[PDB]
Amino acid sequence: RPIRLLPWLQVVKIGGRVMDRGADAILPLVEELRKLLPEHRLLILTGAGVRARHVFSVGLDLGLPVGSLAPLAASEAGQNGHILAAMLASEGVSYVEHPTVADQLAIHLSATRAVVGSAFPPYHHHEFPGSRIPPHRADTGAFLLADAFGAAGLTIVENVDGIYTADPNGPDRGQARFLPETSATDLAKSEGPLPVDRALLDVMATARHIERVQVVNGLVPGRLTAALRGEHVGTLIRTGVRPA
Amino acid sequence: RPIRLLPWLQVVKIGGRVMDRGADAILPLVEELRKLLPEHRLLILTGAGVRARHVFSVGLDLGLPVGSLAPLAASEAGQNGHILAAMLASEGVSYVEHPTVADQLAIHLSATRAVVGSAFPPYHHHEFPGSRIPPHRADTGAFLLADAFGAAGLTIVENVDGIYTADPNGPDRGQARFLPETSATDLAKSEGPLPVDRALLDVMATARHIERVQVVNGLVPGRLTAALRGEHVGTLIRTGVRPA
Amino acid sequence: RPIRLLPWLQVVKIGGRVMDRGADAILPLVEELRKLLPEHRLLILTGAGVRARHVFSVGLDLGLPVGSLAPLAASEAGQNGHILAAMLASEGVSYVEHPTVADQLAIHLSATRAVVGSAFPPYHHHEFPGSRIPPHRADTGAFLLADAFGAAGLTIVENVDGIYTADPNGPDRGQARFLPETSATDLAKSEGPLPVDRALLDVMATARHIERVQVVNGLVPGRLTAALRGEHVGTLIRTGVRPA
Amino acid sequence: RPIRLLPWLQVVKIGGRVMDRGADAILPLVEELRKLLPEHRLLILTGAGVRARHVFSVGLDLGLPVGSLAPLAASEAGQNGHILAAMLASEGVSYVEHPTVADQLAIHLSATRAVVGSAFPPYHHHEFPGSRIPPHRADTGAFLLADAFGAAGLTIVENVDGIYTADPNGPDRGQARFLPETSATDLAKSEGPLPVDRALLDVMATARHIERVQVVNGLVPGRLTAALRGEHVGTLIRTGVRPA
Amino acid sequence: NSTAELEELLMQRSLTDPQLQAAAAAAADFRILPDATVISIGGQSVIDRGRAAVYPLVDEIVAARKNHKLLIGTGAGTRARHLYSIAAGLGLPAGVLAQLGSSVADQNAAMLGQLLAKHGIPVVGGAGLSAVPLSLAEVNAVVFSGMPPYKLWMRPAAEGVIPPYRTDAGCFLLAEQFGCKQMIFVKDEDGLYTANPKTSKDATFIPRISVDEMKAKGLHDSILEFPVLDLLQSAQHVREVQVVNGLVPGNLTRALAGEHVGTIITAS
Amino acid sequence: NSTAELEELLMQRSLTDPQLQAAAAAAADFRILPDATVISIGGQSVIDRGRAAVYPLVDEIVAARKNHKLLIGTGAGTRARHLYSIAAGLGLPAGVLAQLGSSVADQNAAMLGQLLAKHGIPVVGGAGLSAVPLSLAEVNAVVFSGMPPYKLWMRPAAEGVIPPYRTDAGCFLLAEQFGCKQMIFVKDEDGLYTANPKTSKDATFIPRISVDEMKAKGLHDSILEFPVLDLLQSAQHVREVQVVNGLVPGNLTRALAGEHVGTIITAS
Ligand SMILES: Nc1ncnc2c1ncn2[C@@H]1O[C@H](COP(=O)(O)OP(=O)(O)OP(=O)(O)O)[C@@H](O)[C@H]1O
Ligand SMILES: Nc1ncnc2c1ncn2[C@@H]1O[C@H](COP(=O)(O)OP(=O)(O)OP(=O)(O)O)[C@@H](O)[C@H]1O
Ligand SMILES: Nc1ncnc2c1ncn2[C@@H]1O[C@H](COP(=O)(O)OP(=O)(O)OP(=O)(O)O)[C@@H](O)[C@H]1O
Ligand SMILES: Nc1ncnc2c1ncn2[C@@H]1O[C@H](COP(=O)(O)OP(=O)(O)OP(=O)(O)O)[C@@H](O)[C@H]1O
Ligand SMILES: Nc1ncnc2c1ncn2[C@@H]1O[C@H](COP(=O)(O)OP(=O)(O)OP(=O)(O)O)[C@@H](O)[C@H]1O
Ligand SMILES: Nc1ncnc2c1ncn2[C@@H]1O[C@H](COP(=O)(O)OP(=O)(O)OP(=O)(O)O)[C@@H](O)[C@H]1O
Ligand SMILES: [Cl-]
Ligand SMILES: [Cl-]
Ligand SMILES: [Cl-]
Ligand SMILES: [Cl-]
Ligand SMILES: [Mg+2]
Ligand SMILES: [Mg+2]
Ligand SMILES: [Mg+2]
Ligand SMILES: [Mg+2]
């Protein structure tokens, strides 16, 4: 298998819908992140959230193809990243853009303890056809980055406890059972909504390094800290990469 | 409960008998430690090993009390620490003594990524009476330090896979069953040899922060790295401290 | 005049009686200090407080000379320094002793942003005779250090707003008028109690670098921050050193 | 051969007689050292100079053995080291003592760019008998340290251009011819005074790493800088260690 | 049974092995200072009281060292309680409080040592206690600080952050390690009573009692630090202690002459 | 007036309060080593002169300790003056020069101590001076370095960077702190003269003089460091000193027997 480029890196993906709750959720998260800076070297990546749904609504009404909708949604993930970095600026944390992440992440992680970027990949007008909704979103882009770097882990910070057998905020919420652990191949064979991109399961099947990804509730202080230490406080997803 | 003094610290205890195997075991361990320096802030503590058994043999033949034998064994843990630090000197790692660890560890971990010390506590001629063998040895001292600092974890690096139901190198080796997980109270109610100090189970009962300690085989490269990420590759010992 | 050894250093002296108020005063002070670490290079020195009065009471009852009482009081300033450093340990701050301050302060301020020490000088059994109370105490020792280093300033953190014309907590409190600014020679010609050592005025007369010292109320959050920026929020004492 | 402990270190030995010239020589040297700090990792060691000759004169008049005279001369090398470190304190440079150099040099060179120590070895009352003048002095101790660490070089800073065929300040000065290059075995077979310890040639014969040592004139600004880059501006001494 | 059998187990087994522990227990027993007596002087009960309490005890020490070899340890007192209260309110752990209390016991040892210096009696310390042998042989007495050296490695109590092993335990452990013949605690009461005599009208004096009898009547944490009673039951050399009143003139002199003033507490 | 009144002021007032200062002044006065004599040996005036000066004084020390308890402090001398001159030319402050001078006084104490080692007399140091009580009791003498421990916290003089408190002041302050009965300065002149006898033809010898009389005749900075005269006037225990010539055989022996060789300087 290929070598690991940044074997000591921890990647953390923050959901757009977590950021959408405003100060009530962002301030405790910012305080937890601040305490993690002396413990880990962090790449923090933000998702898009509800504003991407509005631009999808306007763009689909205008008839725009999926290659037009993808950079419009990625722009909203960039804005969440600017907001989070501003709250951490006094700790030396800045936001950096796609070209900087792909070529100069190593020197930026030498200058400071953490860096903020966007979780969406730069697929631009070369997004895949098929669905009218861009498939390669924030969960997928964060995993692609983390596996290519050979990072020590990727943790996904959500607004629910983890993956359930049905939407825990939807019509069938009464039948929703929590899944402490599952595999990417098991999830891919299921039908119905998930809290993570369906394309995340596809890139997990071709992964080379990362063996597990945990989804945890960012609205409960302390769970992100525990997950970064490998404690089981959410849903564990096995990717299919085998250990030595 | 009391506050955490160094919440971002990882403590690692290296067994004396691992160091006793010489270059064949030390060189792969040194290479693994080198790769961990950019990932964790480490306090590395060494045990005593076979030379402490020889000084026990001479001292017990001379009739010396347990308060005389304790600093004689701690001196051998200090020598293992000087050896390990010399191999890491080119990475900026030095050995520091008991007074420095208790008062100036914080500034030393700001100057460099890791520090080496002795795992024995400075009980000197004030060791407890009862057994003719000093009870507060390297496992016990390392746990006392890690819990007082409120460190993020303590990992114990052994020359076996973990704790068995009997000595896996002893007379009853045929009946030895591996224990993936156990609790300190369960171990304390058992009789027979263990790979860790019996007094370690006592100080676990009064612990304030550390909830689990993993014992892993330092002769298998990669297991220390996995344990520091919370992966289960040895015996997990539950201390009895409850999480929030 | 002699050269400046550490021209970029800010010295801060914390009164023993401030520390005597416990967590109610220490916790807000610790939080203010934490925010100052990225802004200034700090040497933080602690005074003795009420425990030195008790050891003076026992020692004077035993008949002990002033050279015996001086190191007994300095020990209490050391204990306040250990307490303050423990609260700042997670920021990389440790306590250091008299021999380290005199010879290795420069390398310690390169490893970390701030260092804690004792404000009492090491006069030991060579304290001056005359009064039965040791004259060279915490204010005097902190100024001697700051002027010898040629530091950028010294700020004295008290449990009152500054210097008054009489004790604002004493019998004549009704006639006490606040002094926004004064000179060391003016104070030396007065009779009555002060919030600073009388010997501080003597070493100010022979100073070579420091032109002013401000006394501020450490029980009001924000005043230490303002004083370190040269804002006038307490009593300014002019030493008599002339500017260029 | 043994491994190199600090392969990236440059060692620089400053002659006592250079320091004896006072500010006229020390100030240009301090300015040159200041400019070298961002270019090399430096261990700076000071010799003893003329004050050691006076204590030899008093001690030999009192009849004292060579084991008494050795620590008396080493104390004067320590004083030169305190003086040089004070001039560099604003750059983060401090003096450190013999026990710190032998055990904690690695962490001190991580906290700051350069460290000052004494060039005399700690032979104390265990100096070798034979001559009434201590044989293991500042040149010898600096080489012993540099070779044991496996440092990248040792440069000796003198008050003359290098080694001559006779004392260039002595009675036979008219016949003194400059030696651009020589070997330790060639010097050891000669009779007459040298600018370096005779015992330096002995420890060169058993060296394991350092292949050459250059002696340069510290009274000419720029020569120390050139020597640290391997330029030939003084006398080169070949030790006898062979390259790969 | 044999030295060869002990040495084979010491090389082949873990130190936790019951077979190894049992063989080590049969080793010979050497006493380092068998003719010395350890004396603990209370911090809050004696030294904090000043001249009226300390000066008569200084006279007794000078007189006693003519026929007795004494190791004299000092307690901490009210200055340590103030530090414990500040540090506990901040949430600091037991290991930090232990370092703070050691400095107070050092203060009291220094003050006592200066009253005794003209009689040749020194203050000793350090991890090696290397000044004890020569001083005991020449002037028959030494002064030391009673706090144990555990510092940050101090074992916490089951509840709270007050260090459980303080100056009473420290003094006792030194007596047991040196194999001393006698251990005397000097405080401010005639001895053990059925209740705290300062806060109960009808306390009855107890001349002699075992550790088990003390626990059975609710006196586990009375006039002595409770871990001392547990260490006493594990001890190899010091199987009883005596508690006497230091405010009574001559009480220490008479305890050293073998008079049964105070309370005798026996391990069994 | 009362211990309760002193303790109330000690808790309620600043230490600068004149009422508190006056109550503390009425405290009892304990002398730590009342029967000892402090002897200061000049660095430049004696030890720098070598065998001819040091060997006879060594003989006097060995003879004197039979009937006297001696604390012997060493000066620094010409090696310290060389260091002061280098450091002053660099612009270093008085606190740095004080550390440099202490190491020279340490050298001289070590050389003297090795000539006395076979007589059992040790060199002592450390912030606690913990080896003094036992050594004085057993061999009646100790050697120490005369420089005070102020180091970087040294009070500067009104002009220049030369430390004003050096080995004369250090020796004197130890005598005053220990409550010693006698303080003797050993240098290279018979005593105080009306002018420097090395540089003036007609200097007249002065057998006895007060500090105020010395200042009135321009002798404030003569044979002794000028701060010694000011410390002498503030002293509680040592209210006079004696200056004698160490190059005269037997001068130290006779000063210790109470003969009035040299000059006696009185505080008042
Ligand atoms: N099987 C399921 N298990 C758990 N949650 C589900 C499931 N199916 C749907 N959901 C819903 O998905 C929501 C999470 O929304 P989503 O994943 O779109 O937000 P996000 O990850 O914060 O946004 P972004 O992808 O832009 O970063 C949950 O609040 C939950 O209601
Ligand atoms: N129940 C048990 N489970 C596992 N190992 C055991 C058990 N009982 C005894 N042992 C033995 O303990 C050995 C480990 O020895 P020990 O723990 O004394 O060495 P160490 O921890 O390296 O030394 P130190 O305590 O000086 O650091 C193992 O190799 C094994 O043979
Ligand atoms: N003229 C005065 N102006 C202001 N305060 C005075 C004056 N005279 C006396 N005081 C008293 O001095 C008190 C300060 O006490 P002090 O200076 O002894 O404490 P500290 O400086 O905290 O202690 P330490 O000197 O041990 O650091 C004030 O609370 C005030 O009551
Ligand atoms: N063969 C020689 N070649 C060059 N210089 C010589 C020779 N023989 C004697 N010397 C003299 O040695 C002097 C250097 O003195 P020395 O080496 O003692 O001083 P240093 O090295 O500065 O002192 P330290 O050894 O205490 O550091 C030169 O100035 C020169 O006069
Ligand atoms: N049953 C009892 N019998 C006698 N005394 C008791 C009893 N219970 C409590 N005490 C109290 O215990 C006190 C002695 O312990 P305390 O810790 O107060 O003093 P100390 O030993 O000087 O402490 P330190 O040496 O740590 O300063 C006595 O003054 C007494 O009032
Ligand atoms: N009026 C005076 N009477 C006598 N001696 C005087 C007088 N004025 C100056 N002196 C000189 O003071 C000298 C003694 O002090 P000096 O500092 O030179 O020696 P020291 O005490 O050995 O110094 P150190 O101990 O610091 O080395 C005498 O040698 C003497 O020449
Ligand atoms: Cl999808
Ligand atoms: Cl030579
Ligand atoms: Cl055990
Ligand atoms: Cl005052
Ligand atoms: Mg999601
Ligand atoms: Mg083990
Ligand atoms: Mg004050
Ligand atoms: Mg030379």
From Swiss-Prot, chains A, B, C, D:
SUPFAM superfamilies: Carbamate kinase-like. It is found in: Cytoplasm. The keyword Cytoplasm applies. GO terms for molecular function: molybdenum ion binding; nutrient reservoir activity. Keywords: Cytoplasm, Metal-binding, Molybdenum, Storage protein. The keyword Metal-binding applies. Induction: Requires molybdenum. InterPro entries: AceGlu_kinase-like_sf, Asp/Glu/Uridylate_kinase, MoSto_subunit_alpha/beta. Octamer consisting of 4 alpha and 4 beta chains. Belongs to the UMP kinase family. Highly divergent. This is Molybdenum storage protein subunit alpha. The lineage of its organism: Bacteria, Pseudomonadati, Pseudomonadota, Gammaproteobacteria, Pseudomonadales. The gene is mosA.
UniProtKB/Swiss-Prot annotation, chains E, F:
Keywords: Cytoplasm, Metal-binding, Molybdenum, Storage protein. It is found in: Cytoplasm. Gene3D superfamilies: Acetylglutamate kinase-like. It holds the Pfam family AA_kinase. The keyword Signal does not apply. Optimum pH is 6.5 to 7.0. Above pH 7.1 molybdenum is released. One of its GO terms (cellular component) is cytoplasm. Induction: Requires molybdenum. GO terms for molecular function: molybdenum ion binding; nutrient reservoir activity. Belongs to the UMP kinase family. Highly divergent. Intracellular storage of molybdenum. Binds polyoxomolybdates. Can bind at least 90 molybdenum atoms per protein molecule. Octamer consisting of 4 alpha and 4 beta chains. This is Molybdenum storage protein subunit beta. It comes from Azotobacter vinelandii (strain DJ / ATCC BAA-1303). The lineage of its organism: Bacteria, Pseudomonadati, Pseudomonadota, Gammaproteobacteria, Pseudomonadales. The gene is mosB.
